[PDB]
Structure formats: structure tokens, C-alpha cells
């Protein structure tokens, strides 16, 4: 598949705008989300199958954005994007992120760094995703 027809553009625009705000706070990112109404992406006459594969590939692409070598602010923005994507879908059961073995430990280290940096917003969001178990433990996304 690769990418949905247009999701990469919206994701890049959101992430670039959030990086330009020079803010790591989750609030500014949610204001952007509700400003552009990105949460509405999951409607629009998508049957459950199409919804499932669209959510799978969207989570995979946002995870690609979440992984390095992206810097701290952009990685935090991508984590917020993953959070909202997983939390606003309409699938049954809720589709989860694909996580590689080579990425799980690195992401745990990033969560520890987020905790150490006192920017608890991203760490809490990752812990909420873990509580929701938003991740498959795959070998590659």
C-alpha cells in the first residue's frame, strides 16, 4: 500500500505547524487538532474493512514519523498524532499501532527521557496508549 491518498500531506502539515509553534505542550496540539478537525478523518463512507486498513496504515505512518532521527519536538508531536489517531477511530475492535522489536525498547527509552525532561504530557499520553494497549508487538511496522 504505502500511504493513503492524502494522509501524508495532512500529517506533515500538522507536524510542521506544531514544530513551528515551538511548544511541546499537548494543549497547543489539541487546539490545532480541533482547529483543522483532523479527528473527522475516520468518517466518510468507509466500510469496516477499509476503515481497518486505513487505521492500520495511518498508525504505521504516524509511527514512522514518531521514530528517530526526528528531534524532540517533532517526535512529541508525532506521539500526539498517534494518540489522537488511535483515540478517535471507530473500528471494532480498535486497531492498534504496529511496533517493531527494534523500536519498542527505543520508545521505552524515549518515554524515560520524557519523564526525566519533566515534560509529563507526552509520557502520560504514551502510558495511556499502553493502558489501552494500542501497540501490537510485531517485528516491523
Amino acid at each position: 500500500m504505502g500511504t493513503p491518498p492524502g494522509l501524508q500531506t495532512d500529517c506533515e502539515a500538522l507536524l510542521s505547524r506544531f514544530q513551528e509553534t515551538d511548544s511541546v505542550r499537548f494543549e497547543d496540539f489539541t487546539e490545532l487538532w480541533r482547529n483543522m478537525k483532523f479527528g473527522t478523518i475516520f468518517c466518510g463512507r468507509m466500510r469496516n474493512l477499509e476503515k481497518n486498513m486505513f487505521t492500520k496504515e495511518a498508525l504505521a505512518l504516524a509511527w514512522r514519523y514518531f521514530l528517530p532521527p526526528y528531534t524532540f519536538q517533532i517526535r512529541v508531536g508525532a506521539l500526539y498524532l498517534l494518540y489522537g489517531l488511535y483515540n478517535t477511530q471507530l473500528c471494532q475492535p480498535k486497531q492498534k499501532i504496529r511496533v517493531a522489536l527494534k523500536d519498542w525498547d527505543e520508545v521505552l527509552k524515549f518515554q524515560q527521557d520524557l519523564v526525566n525532561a519533566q515534560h509529563f504530557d507526552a509520557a502520560y499520553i504514551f502510558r495511556k496508549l499502553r493502558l489501552d494497549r494500542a501497540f501490537h508487538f510485531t517485528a516491523m511496522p
Binding site: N35, T40, G44, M46, N48, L49, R133, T138, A139
Partner: protein, 385 residues
């Protein structure tokens, strides 16, 4: 070490031991509970988080090393009201116009030109099989205790290609995707195949069409083997089973045919955890001695509480390509059940006939043979796909 990496971008990965890979995955998850099969709590709006606050805030404070008040503030801040642009009462069948998404713009472009009377329908989007066999089994649990998936069990996605390849396209392949467990042996995967190669029959019966052979291929031959990392896994549970791999090793190793040394082993001696297999790299399986299948390990992951926990369905089919029925040339609409050669009536050789178009054409009321022809019973692979 067993560190998965892409040998080629998005095409295939490095080889690693399945057991060691699963042990490494569990080591990064054991005790944490993220790999458990029990239902965990889910996120909710801040107006209803009071009930879960007592159970969540203390754990959040412990894990994030923050205070309980800080955990509560984080929970209130990260509420879904900040993210839910869609109310829970909104249908997904209509595009919300109050959006700035390019994706939804392209979606509107797709939907607008499909609203005319000639184009409006609720037909298939691009495929149907995947969701039908997902929802039929996703999130379910078995009726028997012995059919319980072990917590943290590896789930392996295996693609088995059909013997009837298009031989006209090379991007996409005819295959069916089987889900298997790490602890399962190869025997239960082999016995679960329903390929038409097991149903092949033969014999020339133009004189007596009613004397078709009693035994299908599955009742006459049982030879089947897998092939991974140069190792053949040959079935020998039954006298009809033969170690086909010995002939291959005799032919190939006698000359520089482009493949290395192989080894022979039985089919039941290994589990899926014992394999050192690549992901995405094709592999070989064979049965009946002439029906080879392309084997691709598309994905591997630990079991999740939302997955199919019912082992009675395993090996679980999740995806399947379609083959078209071979229809007879007389009525050109009914699936053939007979094939004839040297047929004087038929315009071409070979010619396909259905029972209705076969019996009354090649025989009279008394069943006496008419004309000159040779007839064979036929099983359609496009039907039993």
C-alpha cells in the same frame, strides 16, 4: 544477534530464530502485562474519569515519578474532549464538511462521482475476505479450555500460494494467508490445507463414465514436506508418505545447479518456534509430489487480547485470493466436470464438458458410447479454491 532488520526496503528481512525472537519480545514485556490476554481499562472523557481516577492516578504517579495531583492534572489535560472532533452519535457514512483535511477532500472527490443512478451502490470497495474472516474470529474465545492460546504466544502469518499461478502478472500473487502459533508443529499446518491438489483424480472412462475412480489423490498419496533454510521436513506418518527430498538432494547435489547442500528431517520433529526463518523472503512447501507452494512469512507478532483467542479455528485463514471456475465449452456458462481428448464432436482438443453437457452428448439413452473420444473425470481448481 536475533535483531530483525530489512535486507531490502519493505520487501524482506534478516533471518532470526523464532524461539529466541519470542523470548526477546517476552523479556521486554513479561511482568509489564502489556502482552496479557485480559481486557485493560480504556480512555474516556474527563467527565467520566472519576470512577477510574482512583485506580489510574496512583499508577501514573508511580510510573511517571510525578505527584498524584500532577497525575490528575495530566489526566484532565489529556482527556478525549480535546481530541474528539466527532461526537459518539455521528454516523461514518457521510463526510463531515466542517474539516480542512486534504484526505477528506480526496475522499469527497471519490464519493461525488459515485452518486449517480448508474454509479450509486454499496458494493465491494476493493476486497471482502479480510474483514469477513477478521470479524468472524477477532476478539473471540474458545469453547474448550484445551483450545486456549497461551499468553504471550507468538502469532505467525504465513502466505501459501496456489498451484495455479496467473503466469501473466508478477506484482500480485495467488495466495491464502494462514495464521499459526509458535508452539504448533508443522503437522497441524499441513493437515489443515484444503488445496485442490489433494482432490485430483484421473482415469479414462469414455466407455463406462460411471466407473470413476473410488480414491482421490489424498487417499492414494500422502507425501508432503516443507522447506526452510535448506532443511526438508518430510511427512512419514503413513505408508503412503515418501521422503521426496531424497530425490531432490540426489539430483541437485550431483551438479552446480545453483543451490547449496540440503538436509533431510521429519515433518513432526520441529515446531514453529524452532525455525530460523526470514520474514517476507519466500520459502517452499510441497505436497502430492508435484503441487509446490510458495511460502512467505509475512508477519510475526505476540498474541493480543483483542486477537482471535479461539484455537479451534487455528490454523486461521485471514486472507485468500480468488480463482475463476473452468466452465465447459458447450453451454459456456456451467462449470466443467469432464475433459475429453481425441473427441470427434468437440471443436478443439482438449475440450471441457459438464455432466449435463457430457452424458447426453457422448452417450445415448442406453449409455452406449457414441463417436470416437476419450473422457476423463475433471475437478475444477477454480471451484474448490
Amino acid at each position: 544477534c536475533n535483531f530483525p532488520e530489512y535486507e531490502l526496503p519493505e520487501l524482506n528481512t534478516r533471518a532470526f530464530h523464532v524461539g529466541a525472537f519470542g523470548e526477546l519480545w517476552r523479556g521486554r514485556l513479561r511482568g509489564a502485562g502489556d502482552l496479557s490476554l485480559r481486557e485493560p481499562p480504556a480512555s474516556a472523557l474527563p467527565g467520566s474519569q472519576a470512577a477510574d481516577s482512583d485506580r489510574e492516578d496512583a499508577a501514573v504517579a508511580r510510573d511517571l515519578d510525578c505527584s498524584l495531583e500532577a497525575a490528575a492534572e495530566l489526566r484532565a489535560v489529556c482527556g478525549l474532549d480535546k481530541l474528539k472532533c466527532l461526537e459518539d452519535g455521528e454516523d461514518p457514512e457521510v463526510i463531515p464538511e466542517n474539516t480542512d483535511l486534504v484526505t477528506l477532500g480526496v475522499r469527497k472527490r471519490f464519493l461525488e462521482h459515485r452518486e449517480e443512478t448508474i454509479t450509486i451502490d454499496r458494493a465491494c470497495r476493493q476486497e471482502t475476505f479480510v474483514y469477513e474472516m477478521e470479524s468472524h474470529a477477532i476478539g473471540k474465545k474458545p469453547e474448550n479450555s484445551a483450545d486456549m492460546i497461551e499468553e504471550g504466544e507468538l502469532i505467525l502469518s504465513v502466505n501459501i500460494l496456489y498451484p495455479v499461478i496467473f503466469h501473466k502478472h508478477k506484482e500480485h500473487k495467488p495466495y491464502q494467508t494462514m495464521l499459526v502459533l509458535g508452539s504448533q508443529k508443522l503437522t497441524q499446518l499441513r493437515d489443515s490445507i484444503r488445496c485442490v491438489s489433494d482432490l485430483q483424480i484421473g482415469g479414462e472412462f469414455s466407455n463406462t463414465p460411471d466407473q470413476a475412480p473410488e480414491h482421490i489423490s489424498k487417499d492414494l498419496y500422502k507425501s508432503a514436506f516443507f522447506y526452510f533454510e535448506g532443511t526438508f521436513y518430510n511427512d512419514k506418518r503413513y505408508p503412503e508418505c515418501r521422503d521426496l527430498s531424497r530425490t531432490i538432494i540426489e539430483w541437485s547435489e550431483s551438479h552446480d545447479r545453483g543451490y547449496g547442500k540440503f538436509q533431510t528431517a521429519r515433518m513432526e520433529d520441529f515446531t514453529f518456534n524452532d525455525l530460523c526463518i526470514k520474514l517476507g523472503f519466500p520459502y517452499l512447501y510441497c505436497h502430492q509430489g508435484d503441487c509446490e507452494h510458495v511460502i512467505v512469512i509475512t508477519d510475526i507478532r505476540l498474541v493480543h487480547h483483542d486477537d482471535c483467542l479461539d484455537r479451534t479455528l487455528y490454523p486461521l485463514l485471514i486472507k485468500k485470493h480468488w480463482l475463476w471456475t473452468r466452465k465447459c465449452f458447450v453451454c459456456k456458462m456451467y462449470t466443467a466436470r469432464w475433459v475429453t481428448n481425441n473427441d470427434s464432436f468437440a471443436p478443439e482438443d482438449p475440450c471441457f464438458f459438464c455432466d449435463v453437457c457430457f452424458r447426453m452428448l457422448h452417450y445415448d439413452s442406453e449409455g452406449n458410447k457414441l463417436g470416437e473420444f476419450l473422457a476423463y473425470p475433471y475437478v475444477d481448481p477454480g471451484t474448490f479454491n
